[PDB]
Amino acid sequence: SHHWGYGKHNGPEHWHKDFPIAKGERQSPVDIDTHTAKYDPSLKPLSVSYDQATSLRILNNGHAFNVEFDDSQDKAVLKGGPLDGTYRLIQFHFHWGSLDGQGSEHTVDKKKYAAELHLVHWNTKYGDFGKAVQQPDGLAVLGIFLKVGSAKPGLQKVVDVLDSIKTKGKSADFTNFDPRGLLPESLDYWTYPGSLTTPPLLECVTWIVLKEPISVSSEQVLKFRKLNFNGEGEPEELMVDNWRPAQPLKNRQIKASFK
Ligand SMILES: [Cu+2]
Ligand SMILES: [Zn+2]
């Protein structure tokens, strides 16, 4: 639907009126209580295969910016871990704060990171993204926390194009970007069944949240905060605090791939 956002009058506390699944049984994000998470020795190794990833474009959609990929062939896929089958990369985006002390969607023992990266993948058994989001195992989102510290060299090409997509609806060419430069050293993770974190809030997602954050510089996150939620020629509303807070865990268990 239109006109949802992150403001006081249309933010997360209002979403349930148009998207009643907002109060559902497997909503995201959640707080990850690390002491309560259980190590699962049955999980298999996570396989991230991005060598042939083919980026196309970057778009300001009014709530974040998306780096889009060619998903017409198995070029960039996620497999293993909790997943059955093959999941194809379609886009990545971030959520971030107005201040370095907030911005992530997931939290770790109630800790909020400065930002969170979401690599969005769809289950190839379902043929395309739109059919995948009608299935309870349709999507897999790999989540990576950002902390402020040293610069992330592999983020810099993304930061450098943001000036060209300041406002809602703007896009730019974004070919030949390698998303492998956004991953931490370790692929140790937590996993649980959840949902999209923005409307339509669909309950289709296997969440895979990496334990190790990546470090980005202050200057890099400051450039995220210069984007606009609004369209060109409309009153400026900085794109900041585009995160949903933690939702009730309900009848779920978070599993860890490590001890
Ligand atoms: Cu609408
Ligand atoms: Zn997201």
Curated annotation (Swiss-Prot):
Changing E105D: Normal CO(2) hydrase activity. Activated by X-ray, histamine, L-adrenaline, L- and D-phenylalanine, L- and D-histidine, L-His-OMe and beta-Ala-His (carnosine). Changing T198S: Enhanced p-nitrophenyl acetate esterase activity, but normal CO(2) hydrase activity. Changing L196F: Normal activity. Keywords: Acetylation, Cell membrane, Cytoplasm, Disease variant, Lyase, Membrane, Metal-binding, Osteopetrosis, Phosphoprotein, Zinc. Pfam families: Carb_anhydrase. Changing H118 to D/N/Q: Reduced activity. The modification N-acetylserine is found at S1. SMART domains: Carb_anhydrase. It is found in: Cytoplasm; Cell membrane. Zinc. Can also use cobalt(II) with lower efficiency, but not copper(II), nickel(II) and manganese(II). Changing N66H: Enhanced proton transfer. Changing T198H: Higher affinity for bicarbonate. Enhanced proton transfer capacity. InterPro entries: CA_dom, CA_dom_sf, Carbonic_anhydrase_a-class, Carbonic_anhydrase_a-class_CS. The modification Phosphoserine is found at S1, S164, S171. It is linked to Osteopetrosis, autosomal recessive 3: A rare genetic disease characterized by abnormally dense bone, due to defective resorption of immature bone. Osteopetrosis occurs in two forms: a severe autosomal recessive form occurring in utero, infancy, or childhood, and a benign autosomal dominant form occurring in adolescence or adulthood. Recessive osteopetrosis commonly manifests in early infancy with macrocephaly, feeding difficulties, evolving blindness and deafness, bone marrow failure, severe anemia, and hepatosplenomegaly. Interacts with SLC4A4. Interaction with SLC4A7 regulates SLC4A7 transporter activity. Interacts with SLC26A6 isoform 4 (via C-terminus cytoplasmic domain). Belongs to the alpha-carbonic anhydrase family. This is Carbonic anhydrase 2. The gene is CA2.
